[PDB]
Design an enzyme around this catalytic site. Structure first.
Site, PDB file in Angstrom:
ATOM      1  N   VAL A 197       0.781  -1.024   0.069  1.00  0.00           N
ATOM      2  CA  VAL A 197       0.125  -0.130  -0.132  1.00  0.00           C
ATOM      3  C   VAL A 197       0.828   1.306  -0.049  1.00  0.00           C
ATOM      4  O   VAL A 197       0.656   2.225  -0.716  1.00  0.00           O
ATOM      5  CB  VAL A 197      -0.855  -0.073   1.212  1.00  0.00           C
ATOM      6  CG1 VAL A 197      -2.138   0.848   0.945  1.00  0.00           C
ATOM      7  CG2 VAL A 197      -1.418  -1.369   1.538  1.00  0.00           C
ATOM      8  N   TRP A 250      47.366  15.392  22.544  1.00  0.00           N
ATOM      9  CA  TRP A 250      48.256  16.411  23.383  1.00  0.00           C
ATOM     10  C   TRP A 250      49.697  16.377  22.479  1.00  0.00           C
ATOM     11  O   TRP A 250      50.674  16.929  22.874  1.00  0.00           O
ATOM     12  CB  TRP A 250      48.478  16.090  24.757  1.00  0.00           C
ATOM     13  CG  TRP A 250      47.142  16.215  25.634  1.00  0.00           C
ATOM     14  CD1 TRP A 250      46.258  15.466  25.649  1.00  0.00           C
ATOM     15  CD2 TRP A 250      47.103  17.309  26.456  1.00  0.00           C
ATOM     16  NE1 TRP A 250      45.298  16.043  26.476  1.00  0.00           N
ATOM     17  CE2 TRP A 250      45.823  17.078  27.024  1.00  0.00           C
ATOM     18  CE3 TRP A 250      47.643  18.525  26.724  1.00  0.00           C
ATOM     19  CZ2 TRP A 250      45.199  17.999  27.805  1.00  0.00           C
ATOM     20  CZ3 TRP A 250      47.037  19.500  27.587  1.00  0.00           C
ATOM     21  CH2 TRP A 250      45.793  19.367  28.113  1.00  0.00           C
ATOM     22  N   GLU A 302      41.953   9.638  26.738  1.00  0.00           N
ATOM     23  CA  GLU A 302      42.387  10.924  27.573  1.00  0.00           C
ATOM     24  C   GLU A 302      41.615  11.015  28.949  1.00  0.00           C
ATOM     25  O   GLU A 302      42.352  11.355  29.909  1.00  0.00           O
ATOM     26  CB  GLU A 302      41.940  12.187  26.383  1.00  0.00           C
ATOM     27  CG  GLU A 302      42.043  13.553  27.260  1.00  0.00           C
ATOM     28  CD  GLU A 302      41.419  14.686  26.260  1.00  0.00           C
ATOM     29  OE1 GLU A 302      40.555  14.490  25.885  1.00  0.00           O
ATOM     30  OE2 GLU A 302      42.254  15.495  26.180  1.00  0.00           O
ATOM     31  N   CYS A 328      41.191  24.714  28.720  1.00  0.00           N
ATOM     32  CA  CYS A 328      39.757  25.090  28.124  1.00  0.00           C
ATOM     33  C   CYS A 328      38.503  24.784  28.916  1.00  0.00           C
ATOM     34  O   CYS A 328      37.812  25.650  29.054  1.00  0.00           O
ATOM     35  CB  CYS A 328      39.816  24.740  26.744  1.00  0.00           C
ATOM     36  SG  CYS A 328      40.898  25.219  25.574  1.00  0.00           S
ATOM     37  N   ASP A 369      36.360  25.768  20.112  1.00  0.00           N
ATOM     38  CA  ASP A 369      36.694  25.716  18.650  1.00  0.00           C
ATOM     39  C   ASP A 369      35.359  24.871  18.293  1.00  0.00           C
ATOM     40  O   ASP A 369      35.151  23.871  18.345  1.00  0.00           O
ATOM     41  CB  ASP A 369      37.873  24.924  18.430  1.00  0.00           C
ATOM     42  CG  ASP A 369      38.135  24.676  16.838  1.00  0.00           C
ATOM     43  OD1 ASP A 369      37.184  25.102  16.162  1.00  0.00           O
ATOM     44  OD2 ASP A 369      39.246  24.256  16.428  1.00  0.00           O
ATOM     45  N   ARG A 422      35.808  28.106  28.708  1.00  0.00           N
ATOM     46  CA  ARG A 422      36.353  29.431  28.433  1.00  0.00           C
ATOM     47  C   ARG A 422      36.860  29.629  26.761  1.00  0.00           C
ATOM     48  O   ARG A 422      36.765  30.893  26.228  1.00  0.00           O
ATOM     49  CB  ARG A 422      37.742  29.682  28.735  1.00  0.00           C
ATOM     50  CG  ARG A 422      38.912  29.042  28.883  1.00  0.00           C
ATOM     51  CD  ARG A 422      40.096  29.526  29.225  1.00  0.00           C
ATOM     52  NE  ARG A 422      41.453  28.800  28.895  1.00  0.00           N
ATOM     53  CZ  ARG A 422      41.823  28.742  27.753  1.00  0.00           C
ATOM     54  NH1 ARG A 422      41.763  29.961  26.816  1.00  0.00           N
ATOM     55  NH2 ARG A 422      42.759  27.889  27.439  1.00  0.00           N
TER      56      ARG A 422
END
Ligand SMILES: NC(=O)C1=CN([C@@H]2O[C@H](COP(=O)(O)OP(=O)(O)OC[C@H]3O[C@@H](n4cnc5c(N)ncnc54)[C@H](OP(=O)(O)O)[C@@H]3O)[C@@H](O)[C@H]2O)C=CC1
Ligand SMILES: NC(=O)C1=CN([C@@H]2O[C@H](COP(=O)(O)OP(=O)(O)OC[C@H]3O[C@@H](n4cnc5c(N)ncnc54)[C@H](OP(=O)(O)O)[C@@H]3O)[C@@H](O)[C@H]2O)C=CC1
Ligand SMILES: CCc1nc(N)nc(N)c1Cc1ccc(-c2cccc(C(=O)O)c2)cc1
Ligand SMILES: CCc1nc(N)nc(N)c1Cc1ccc(-c2cccc(C(=O)O)c2)cc1
Ligand SMILES: O=c1ccn([C@H]2C[C@H](O)[C@@H](COP(=O)(O)O)O2)c(=O)[nH]1
Ligand SMILES: O=c1ccn([C@H]2C[C@H](O)[C@@H](COP(=O)(O)O)O2)c(=O)[nH]1
Lengths: 525, 530
Positions: free
Chosen positions: A148, A324, A302, A410, A433, A430
């Site tokens: 259908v 890092w 991390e 950050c 990106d 703070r």
């Protein structure tokens, strides 16, 4: 004027992903309609509520316009309000007899072999238009099933498709027709939800082709950065965008339209704004961006490294985690006036501050057991013991140690909030990106929230991201333009090995992302 | 039946200031219309721009219904323009270069002058009823009564005004004619706007009301399929909920009281009072257009300024403020409080290494409130002031009070965790993150506190203040505050005041109490939250 427009014919389906065999994803990933006569899943109540609400809603103050329209089209002056639900023969056999006919709907069964001797049997799809042309009804819904759906789409008799996306994999024998991106376009997307151990989201396909014055007066005093919004044609063509991913995407949009043009260090130039907040419901989804591929193995190693309190960059690099790598090079440390710092000794950064805040940092090999403030232990104790405390914070921004760090954090701080066995997290960033870092940052603190929640016998609830200086780098603008005009998929989920009861015992195997449906990877440059 | 002002859509528009006389402020505060035939203020642009936009704006689509409406009322069957009506004096107060008002149908009420004494394209009428006649014979969108005081007076008396678009000018001037005292039983406010600054005065725009794709709206209903409290009956917010548009910056504050009341979580806390709490809010304030000193209750700024000054000096000595009769920190400094903080070797009102210490001497070992800490620890304030001047695009301009190592030695851990600064185009903006937020008592002052500080930092760095941004962490309402907040949430804000700082203050340490001036604070009555 068109039959599907005059008579208001819509479909409504729920499709799941299908078993198979690098996987590719498109809208046609969600196409499983049924298995062995029945639904592919055992029960997903939230879709039933949606379906039952959608196929029974009517607005009587709008029928006089529809009734008038239908009459003029058929060259007539004449034809409790109810919708019409059109079903296939097998589909009618599918439903239990106590749920047949469907409550408060004009049930219509398409069949060549039926007619018991009210429920209407129509032998051909053309008898529908004839039957609707002499009925009082608000809107007409094609409940399928598989055949259908096929014919009604072929005959362009479908105005909108109400498409539930069930984000899990099932065994099926019947599948939805491949929706034809020329015939239909997604106009709206809903929130993501969890129901019966699966995420799902609701999308709409559209067929293609006094206080009013007062508001204007208040706008009397009301693009800017060489962005032509026709590049966001698909993004600006969606009426409803409830998907939580749009929180991220709208922030991209706002910076691009309104951002302040600013130089920075690298010389790329950013567009920046100041002050944003995003909220994600960790109990409904895991906010892993679906409008491009994201990897989580390095993100988790991390965070495990953070939990150990290591500052030794070499541990990550021997696991091929290179987040890092650039901050530990001879050149990078020399530019930071860290001339007496061993390569990849990142100094007193996150892990150190979380486990030894205040301790004298010497080198990454030193033994710091019991030196300084075990911030991580402190907040875990507070969650278990003083849950309404307003002092449950994990702070990485040690003003005395900033200059000794390979770079300052950050992610300034996590604050936690506990209610009704639920744990919410705020992270204040703070510097953000938006193009490259924020997608990863959302996942890190969400995972961390889950981790904290599980070792404190609590359920995760909300992850709240506060953006400070929030910026799009210019060399990302083209890539984000591609990404704004992709439409999110339903989010995945995160599974934690249930047996880990302490924050230090998590290992990489204890993490599992389930049902990650994503668009193609985008190199941001 | 029907009323004349609705069929013929008769509105009044005016602009009112404060006039010459612990004073009381009501709506009748703003009533000054003109002085010596002219306007009392020199030139307030944004009001004229607002006046022009309202009186010239038409919407052609709505006129078809409008012609029907007036046709059925009268028992009957160039672009569209509005009607403006003025008294004779009002008309002669206008420079001839601007008469008659562009793109408008000018109607002048007069008895001593005739159409013969007029050069201009203008209708003269000698009595009010003839405007009603003329309105019936013309084609126009809306009709605006411009004044003056007599024209305003009799149109309000004869119930011929449907909506009053009213500019509250928040400065004082010498006046000789006055807008009539609006009757609250006859008219009530329905929409407050943003606050603006224009030609050295803050203003907003308020509206009085007279008292007594079509199927994609369905898509909206479908998506609200999975939605649906505390012991708050919303009939206790009649005024608050009735307001149509609440664009006054103070509703950012008030809307959070409402959200926490209607939705928050009942939790206990240290005090035993228990609270309603939510997690994560953000307020923005445009310090270039107003100083956000709340207007729905009276607030004083002398104590908090002294506090900010004490902070910048690096002090931790509770006696300094008590000798200024400032008691903000007094209870956190008693022998008893310090003992319950297990600071047994701390002298009374020695608060330990709190904000002032962390801003000038972060990391230094604290000894007592009398030690000379000079060049011990990291001088955060100086570092951000040099960051703003010399590295304005840095994303590292952060001031932090949350010294994890010193927390236990503080009388209390800080509520205001950090200030981050942002500079663009010579404008300074500030984010402060607050971990714990007491919406009934603390937050009104904390908005004032960090607004002033942004101004002070902006000035000593030669920038203009722009945006103060408040991120609330744990935002809570004490149960013993709810009933006062119910009163306050049903008060209608006034235009915000302004902050003036002495311009000669070129460094952040040199400010004194008398360098700060708060002007034109119009406010409701004082409120004891208890
Ligand atoms: N997840 C979802 O949203 C949905 C799930 N489902 C699932 O899908 C499956 C049912 O779909 P399916 O199994 O394909 O069977 P259908 O529900 O598609 O009905 C098929 C039957 O409809 C009749 N039919 C088809 N075309 C016409 C026509 N042009 N004129 C007259 N009669 C016609 C035929 O019966 P005749 O012999 O009478 O011609 C055909 O056998 C089940 O597994 C069910 O659980 C059901 C609905 C939607
Ligand atoms: N800030 C604001 O919002 C406003 C400020 N203003 C200020 O207000 C002042 C002027 O207002 P005001 O001083 O009251 O003078 P008006 O504008 O009220 O003019 C009064 C005159 O209008 C005529 N008039 C008034 N009512 C009638 C009537 N029912 N029938 C016939 N003629 C009538 C008479 O003219 P005649 O002498 O010919 O009989 C009367 O003397 C000025 O200072 C002006 O700048 C003006 C408008 C609003
Ligand atoms: C829920 C799966 C689904 N979702 C959407 N979006 N489109 C669909 N076509 C379906 C299939 C479906 C199967 C059974 C019923 C049913 C049974 C009994 C009673 C009732 C009732 O509403 O009382 C409904 C409905 C739909
Ligand atoms: C401006 C004070 C005011 N504000 C508001 N809200 N309501 C009002 N009634 C008035 C009074 C008023 C005075 C002068 C003009 C005028 C003069 C020249 C040119 C023009 C023009 O529009 O070209 C207007 C208009 C109004
Ligand atoms: O986890 C991270 C780490 C870094 N950044 C970005 C934000 C800024 O572009 C830069 C931070 O360094 P500063 O420019 O603020 O010094 O790196 C992120 O978005 N997420
Ligand atoms: O400037 C201030 C100082 C204190 N508080 C309030 C918030 C809390 O009710 C209390 C401190 O809460 P704790 O987290 O210390 O329990 O003081 C403020 O709102 N603003």
């Amino acid at each position: 004027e068109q039959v599907c427009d005059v008579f208001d014919i819509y479909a409504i389906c729920a499709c799941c992903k299908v078993e198979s065999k690098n996987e590719v994803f498109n809208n046609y990933t969600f196409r499983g309609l049924g298995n062995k006569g029945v639904l592919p899943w055992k029960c997903i109540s939230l879709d039933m509520k949606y379906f039952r609400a959608v196929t029974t809603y009517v607005n009587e103050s709008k029928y006089e316009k529809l009734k008038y329209k239908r009459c003029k089209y058929l060259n007539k002056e004449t034809v409790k309000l109810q919708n019409v639900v059109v079903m296939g023969r097998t589909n009618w056999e599918s439903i239990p007899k106590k749920f047949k006919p469907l409550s408060n709907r004009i049930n219509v069964i398409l069949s060549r072999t039926l007619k018991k001797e009210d429920v209407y049997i129509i032998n051909k799809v053309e008898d529908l238009i004839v039957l609707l042309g002499k009925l009082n009804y608000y809107k007409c819904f094609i409940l399928g099933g598989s055949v259908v759906y096929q014919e009604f789409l072929e005959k362009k008799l479908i105005k909108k498709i109400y498409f539930t996306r069930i984000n899990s994999t099932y065994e099926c024998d019947v599948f939805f027709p491949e929706i034809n991106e020329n015939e239909y376009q997604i106009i709206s997307v809903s929130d993501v939800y969890t129901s019966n151990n699966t995420t799902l989201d609701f999308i709409i396909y559209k067929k293609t082709n006094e206080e009013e014055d007062d508001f204007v007066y208040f706008n009397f005093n009301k693009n800017k950065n060489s962005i032509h919004p026709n590049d966001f044609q698909i993004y600006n063509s969606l009426k409803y965008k409830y998907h939580p991913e749009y929180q991220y995407l709208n922030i991209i949009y706002d910076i691009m339209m309104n951002g302040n043009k600013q130089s920075d260090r690298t010389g790329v130039g950013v567009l920046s704004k100041f002050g944003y907040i995003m909220k994600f419901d960790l109990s409904q989804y895991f906010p892993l961006l679906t409008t491009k591929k994201l990897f989580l193995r390095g993100i988790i190693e991390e965070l495990l490294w953070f939990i150990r309190g290591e500052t030794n960059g070499n541990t990550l690099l021997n696991k091929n985690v290179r987040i890092w790598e650039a901050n530990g090079t001879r050149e990078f440390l020399d530019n930071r006036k860290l001339f007496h710092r061993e390569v990849n000794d990142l100094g007193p950064i996150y892990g150190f501050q979380w486990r030894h805040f205040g301790a004298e940092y010497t080198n990454m090999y030193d033994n710091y057991e019991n030196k300084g403030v075990d911030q991580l232990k402190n907040i875990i104790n507070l969650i278990k013991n003083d849950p309404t405390s307003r002092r449950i914070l994990l702070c990485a921004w040690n003003v005395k140690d900033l200059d000794q760090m390979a770079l300052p954090p950050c992610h300034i701080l996590c604050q936690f909030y506990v209610f009704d066995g639920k744990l919410s997290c705020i992270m204040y960033q703070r510097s953000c990106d938006l193009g490259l870092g924020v997608p990863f940052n959302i996942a890190s603190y969400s995972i961390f929230t889950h981790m904290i929640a599980q070792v404190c016998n609590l359920q995760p609830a909300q992850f709240i991201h506060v953006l400070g200086n929030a910026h799009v780098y210019n060399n990302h603008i083209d890539s984000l333009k591609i990404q704004l005009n992709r439409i999110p998929y339903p989010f995945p989920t995160l599974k934690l090995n249930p047996d880990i009861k302490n924050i230090e015992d998590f290992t990489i195997s204890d993490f599992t992302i389930q049902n990650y449906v994503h668009h193609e990877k985008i190199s941001m440059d």
